[PDB]
Amino acid sequence: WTAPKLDPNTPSPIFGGSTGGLLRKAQVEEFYVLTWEAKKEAIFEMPTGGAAIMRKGPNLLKLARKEQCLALLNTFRSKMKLDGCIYRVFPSGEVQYLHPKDGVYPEKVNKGRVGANQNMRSIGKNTNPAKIKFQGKLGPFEV
Amino acid sequence: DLKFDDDWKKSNVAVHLASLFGWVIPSASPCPAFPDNASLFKVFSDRISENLAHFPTGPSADDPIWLYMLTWHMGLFACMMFGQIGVQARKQGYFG
Amino acid sequence: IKTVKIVVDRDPVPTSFEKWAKPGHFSRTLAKGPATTTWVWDLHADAHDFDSHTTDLEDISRKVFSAHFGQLGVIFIWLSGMYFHGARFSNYEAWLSDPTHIKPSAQVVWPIVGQEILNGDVGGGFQGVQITSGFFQLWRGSGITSELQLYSTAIGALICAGLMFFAGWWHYHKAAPKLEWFQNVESMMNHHLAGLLGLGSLAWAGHQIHIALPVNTLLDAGVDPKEIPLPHEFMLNRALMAELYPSFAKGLTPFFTFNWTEYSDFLTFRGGLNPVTGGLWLTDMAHHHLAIAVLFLVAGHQYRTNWGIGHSMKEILEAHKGPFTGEGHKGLYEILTTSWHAQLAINLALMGSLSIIVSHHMYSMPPYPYLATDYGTQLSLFTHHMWIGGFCICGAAAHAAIFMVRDYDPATNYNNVLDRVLRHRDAIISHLNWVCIFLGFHSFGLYIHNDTMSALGRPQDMFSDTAIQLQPIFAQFVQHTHALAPELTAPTAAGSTSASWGGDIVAVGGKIAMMPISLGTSDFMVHHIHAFTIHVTVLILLKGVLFARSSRLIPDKANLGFRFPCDGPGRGGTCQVSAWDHVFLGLFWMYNSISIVIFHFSWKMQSDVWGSVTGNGVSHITGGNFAQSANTINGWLRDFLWAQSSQVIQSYGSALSAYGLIFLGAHFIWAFSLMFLFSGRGYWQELIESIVWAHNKLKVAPAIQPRALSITQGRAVGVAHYLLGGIATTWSFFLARIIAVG
Amino acid sequence: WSIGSTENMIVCFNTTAILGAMRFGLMPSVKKNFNGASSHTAMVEQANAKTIGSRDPSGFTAVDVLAGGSLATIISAGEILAGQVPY
Amino acid sequence: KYGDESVYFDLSDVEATTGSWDVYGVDSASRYPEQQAAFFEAAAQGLGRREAVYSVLAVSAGLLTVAYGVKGAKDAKLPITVGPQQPAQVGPRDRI
Amino acid sequence: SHAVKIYDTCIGCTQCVRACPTDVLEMVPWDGCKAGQIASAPRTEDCVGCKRCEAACPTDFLSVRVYLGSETTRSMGLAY
Amino acid sequence: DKVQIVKPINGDPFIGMLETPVTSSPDVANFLSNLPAYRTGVAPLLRGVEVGLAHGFFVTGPFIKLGPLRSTDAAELAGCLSGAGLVLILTACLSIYGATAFQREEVVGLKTLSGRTIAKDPLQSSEGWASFTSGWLVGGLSGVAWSYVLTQVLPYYS
Ligand code: CLA
Ligand code: CLA
Ligand code: CLA
Ligand code: CLA
Ligand code: CLA
Ligand SMILES: CC1=C(/C=C/C(C)=C/C=C/C(C)=C/C=C/C=C(C)/C=C/C=C(C)/C=C/C2=C(C)CCCC2(C)C)C(C)(C)CCC1
Ligand SMILES: CC1=C(C/C=C(\C)CCC[C@H](C)CCC[C@H](C)CCCC(C)C)C(=O)c2ccccc2C1=O
Ligand code: SF4
Ligand code: SF4
């Protein structure tokens, strides 16, 4: 995984339209793009609602939330055993490689990942909130 | 394509005339249920004339114009809707 | 084009008690054993969840069929009980001679703890619990004149229940049909129209003509039930039957020569009510059932089964498509031939609507002798069938959601009529929600504005009939057209379908069998309330069904299941997202709506229909206060709840003391439901932890670990007790009120 | 009612006409109807009911006879009972 | 390109990708008569500023409430402004 | 956004990671457990707070914990 | 040949909208596009003028015919003063909306369904909404006064 995969203009799945697609948030704030390689043409379920047909080869799909993209990708991986990546696209026009964020699915341990938000202690060894009183602390968990 | 078709109505003058007159004529035919073998259109027009003499005063709640209006307009609109459906379906491949 | 035939696997499962000895055999997680007390509730919750037990649809279909056999055996037991009680524990023979003054009663209590007071003075030299099921009126309309006939049919019903159980055992353990047997829907419709409804209606028309019609004619003439000739003496002796109705002297010759006009004396189209009994003309009901039989017999030859004539329902579904609906109804045949839950949703919806229509049509057109005059049974039947209808509709929504989560396949529904609904569910739900808000605002302000104006001393600014006329002009128009139907649009009818439309109030023995019902502004307001409450219940249920698989909040909701508590406190909080929870709230609103429908019915009938004519106009039960008081919430609180509660709260020391005790108890159960509803599992689990500590202190710790109810189960218990308490409160109130006032 | 009466002649004419119609492919029958057809003007032979058992050279069946007789009796009832209604 | 077959993503055409479409808006510069426009420009000459509107509405609130409490309520013949003009009634326990 | 913390009782069963619907959690090499891997929460900004990780964590008491904090658009799970 | 009417918004099936005979019909589109709110090239003040006139004209009627003084001879004057008061309240609502709503950049542009890039509506700005509010106030008060005039003038009014 030398570099993240770039985002081309690949064909989108066949869909008749729905009212569950992108709202104004895509225009003002952000929206997410899911791209996957399909082994064969098949009918999948849109996370917004309705049924769509994915095209053989690469597909591109823009969705409102990362959760929708990841739910659909997890469906593709667990049922159809496909591979896919997610991008975040801002209104300024800069995309952002999101899934898996390493080139390796997070459930598989991969070298080079650095532990973030790890407390090297058990849950009961957290101090009491009275000891961190009047301190800029989120809670006992962040000390 | 996936663009909306501005001719969704497919408004056909022949459909409009066929539906309107092919309900009016059967509804203007003799009906032995009505008095003097009068037609539904006949009694409806009679009630319209009687109530149009008193133009501002609306028809009384008990006046037969309401039942005639409903039972005529249903058949009319049925002819309009089914005529459009049948014409546009025959034009398309729904039948042959 | 598969041939319709009988297919069976011989001896598919042995008959043995080994599974009875082992609870939870049907599952895999429940089969291993109880680790925690949640296991009991899980066992009972999935006892009848056949889809979650076995993957194959054949075994599920067999289980459903034999379970239906068991239910029908249970229903036959219940009927056998009712007929047996009407024979050895009732005053049906006394009530036959004086139906207007003797209260029907078919339950007598044992004199143990002072409960003998519940054996009320129902008349006929008899004491017992007055019944409101209308069974006495049904038996009189069926021509039963002796307790031996009731006993005979009770024993028949018990035999039939045994046969129903034996049929279920046979069709699960001996002759279970294959899956291709159950999927013959064409044949099903052909038989269930021509043979279930068609031949059933024909059989009942024959009974009515040959047994009920002569016996009830003699009863109408004043003949003593103990002097009436027996039914076989009418069915077989044609001279005896022809003496009452001279057309029987012509035999079946007019029938088979299409000279059916000669049968006009016993096959009539009179319309209205029998002035002596206050029920529908039995000649009218016989002619009705005959025509219904013929119509269903003809309609049961629609579908092709084994000979080329007929319809294929797949083809007639798929051929119905259009420019707005894509592929149309394509794929629905697969939905409804490979999913029991889809069929169950449709059938429950239609059953519930039907029970509602049944209640409406029976109060308005009393089909039984001395039914309308007995106000208590009429109110009870209306309220009962309303509640059954609302429950069945809620279940229809639930099973629609269950199908949508479990048995819905996007591959077989690509651009059909269902997938497009799923593709604009946002528009549907937003418009329905808008409608719901609109309806509520307008209707409630119609009541709240009136409350405010009355309290401010401004009756001229109220929405009453006097001040602002919100007249239901359309309903009044329909009433007018129906009262004038026997003259122009139903010329052969000798009278209107019901006396509720207008004219010629029907009175039997002083009390009014049926009275034309008026519709003023209060009727407008309450009907728009009804529509509001219906539309909100539909909003909840349809939102649950449409958002059963996904939403903008939770996209991966289909794999969470039909019945899950939440997805977590994230996304701001994802409580009650499952379609099951929508049925929970849906059930709640259903209850709320029915509570208003039956209140409107009770008040309107007591005020404007029910009463007693004394030669000086009508003396209604409540004096016609509905039209001027039912436009305010205060009016319902005072003139309906507070005023009519005097019977139930002052029922102590009389036979209605049981109704008073149930009134209090149902109040308690409703408040007790509020515990389960307003609380959450975490608190109760911690309280259980403290109690478990107390038990462990004394070495009383159970092997099955105590657990708080699951969140879904907590909601289930809350809604169940809420519905029980609310409905039983209304039941005790209605029955005590209407029995005491009479 | 008698042989040659109006009602007898109506029903006999109805059953003769209906049976002839579905014997010669003028009405939908067991072996030829609109099941799996194309348009309103053309019926098609039904392979499922093809050769279902007959000794009539056009393949007319007993179920064809029963269906035509039932429909003819239905129509004869409708026509005869017109004019018998009281009004 | 956004216009390609089955392509609805374009970092150059961000507006079409995100759906920010003017559905019914029209950019025609003039629709009203010019002098009518001038009159209504002059009628709202000082009010085009938001804080001027704030001052207008504060003053209007004060004047309307003062006039209502002084003259408006009485002019409308409100029952509250009209006196009770009836004999009084005594509560139970002879408590006036 | 919310706060997700991983504690050293983690056995590296990956169930928290597989349960996450927003890809907040990932497995990293670690010598502390037998399996040789601990979870981590780099993309904490995407945590909606659904607590599926806590539901899927077998260790008693939980090795992954989600503490609801400041609510953003992503945390609120809004498509608008 | 098997025409489908309902289509996705502008042919994109991944946006939360569908084009139907209620949304994209030519008559509906022409009616809505000709309404003052959708005349983005026109000055916001004059669009607010027409808006205020139409709205203040009709809104008076409910107060005339259903207000507390509907029975009295002063029914019309009461209803028109109620309408003017409501116009003032709506002017306050408009002023506060204009102060608060347009605080963000909104970097994304706007295009027509044909794909023509067009400038943003001047109405959709703080000062533009202020001018629109002023036009609303003038139009609403003129419309309320006109409703009063017509109730006092129109021959078949009752
Ligand atoms: C003339 C034919 C006929 C008749 C009367 C019925 C009647 C009935 N069927 Mg249907 N059924 C038929 C043909 C028929 N079926 C065919 C051909 C098939 C195969 C395609 C099915 C498949 C089918 C299924 C899958 C189910 C039913 C069910 C039912 C029952 C519904 C409950 C109800 O309405 O209670 C009406 C109650 C009565 C009329 C009381 C008497 C009850 C007995 C059982 C009626 C006898 C009917 C039987 C066909 C004749 C005896 C045959 C037997 C000796 C072999 C009802 C009894 C459901 C049910 O409840 O299962 C038990 C159900 O799940 N049926
Ligand atoms: C299902 C409903 C039903 C039933 C069962 C009956 C039954 C009857 N009707 Mg009624 N009827 C009905 C509906 C019904 N009706 C309706 C809807 C109408 C309105 C049009 C009428 C109008 C009507 C009139 C006007 C008359 C009747 C009459 C009769 C009787 C004459 C039967 C007869 O000889 O015909 C022929 C029947 C048969 C040929 C069948 C008998 C076959 C047996 C059972 C075969 C058994 C053989 C067995 C294999 C071996 C034998 C030995 C074994 C026992 C050991 C009979 C009791 C007549 C009568 O006397 O009434 C008082 C009469 O005049 N009906
Ligand atoms: C034809 C009718 C019909 C049929 C065949 C079914 C069948 C089924 N339903 Mg449906 N349902 C129905 C009607 C029906 N239901 C109605 C009317 C409603 C609205 C209330 C529902 C609401 C509903 C929900 C919400 C759910 C089901 C579920 C199920 C399944 C499991 C049921 C089970 O094992 O629970 C066994 C039965 C119980 C645990 C109920 C116990 C009794 C309750 C508390 C009520 C007792 C009230 C009583 C009359 C009052 C007196 C009590 C007294 C002793 C004090 C099964 C497929 C469940 C499922 O998973 O579907 C797949 C599910 O979640 N149904
Ligand atoms: C009396 C109690 C009450 C009230 C007023 C409401 C009101 C509402 N519920 Mg709730 N609900 C309740 C109890 C209640 N519910 C209970 C106990 C349950 C069981 C859990 C539910 C379950 C529930 C669900 C599951 C749903 C609702 C829905 C609704 C809405 C239906 C639309 C409607 O009524 O029109 C509008 C609102 C009213 C008419 C409410 C009364 C307001 C009056 C008329 C005052 C009007 C304005 C007034 C003058 C105030 C302005 C001045 C003020 C600032 C001083 C509404 C917000 C549905 C919804 O939101 O979709 C539409 C829905 O889906 N509710
Ligand atoms: C929604 C229910 C409802 C309704 C219908 C009414 C109706 C009314 N109230 Mg009551 N009121 C209600 C709720 C309601 N009230 C509630 C909940 C309270 C709180 C306790 C009050 C308290 C109250 C008081 C204290 C008083 C009234 C008064 C009045 C009257 C005048 C109100 C007024 O000036 O409206 C002004 C109305 C409007 C500005 C607009 C109304 C809406 C329009 C017509 C909608 C049209 C939309 C249209 C169809 C869309 C077309 C689109 C198309 C162009 C494309 C009127 C009869 C007054 C009175 O005495 O009169 C009898 C009075 O003094 N009301
Ligand atoms: C030519 C020929 C011949 C002859 C033939 C014939 C002549 C036949 C006939 C046939 C027939 C002739 C048949 C019939 C049938 C019938 C039927 C099948 C009937 C039915 C009925 C029904 C079903 C009814 C119903 C009803 C009733 C009961 C009442 C009510 C109404 C109604 C109507 C609905 C021969 C063989 C020699 C040889 C060859 C050639
Ligand atoms: C009261 C309550 C509980 C606590 C209820 C406990 C766990 C169970 C109810 C008690 C039953 C009766 C225990 C079963 C008793 C055994 C069957 C023992 C035999 C009975 C002898 C005493 C005769 C919840 O767990 C709960 C959960 C979610 C929302 C609301 C609530 C809630 O309101
Ligand atoms: S956190 Fe719980 S689940 Fe995630 S890895 Fe460590 S142990 Fe397995
Ligand atoms: S809370 Fe929901 S999102 Fe945040 S980590 Fe646990 S699972 Fe992933």
Author numbering:
A (entry chain D): 46 to 188
B (entry chain O): 40 to 135
C (entry chain A): 10 to 751
D (entry chain K): 45 to 131
E (entry chain H): 71 to 166
F (entry chain C): 2 to 81
G (entry chain L): 47 to 204
Study text:
Here, we report the structure and function of the O. tauri photosystem I (PSI) supercomplex in low light conditions, where it expands its photon-absorbing capacity by assembling with the light-harvesting complexes I (LHCI) and a prasinophyte-specific light-harvesting complex (Lhcp). In terms of pigment composition, OtLhcp1 and OtLhcp2 each contain 14 Chl molecules (8 Chl a, 5 Chl b, and 1 Mdp) and 7 carotenoid molecules (4 Dlt, 2 Prx, and 1 Nex).
Four Lhca (Lhca1-4) complexes are associated with the PSI core at the side of PsaG- F-J-K, similar to those found in plant PSI-LHCI complexes. On the other side formed by PsaG-I-M-H, an Lhca5-Lhca6 heterodimer is associated with the PSI core. Notably, this supercomplex did not exhibit far-red peaks in the 77 K fluorescence spectra, which is possibly due to the weak coupling of the chlorophyll a603-a609 pair in OtLhca1-4.
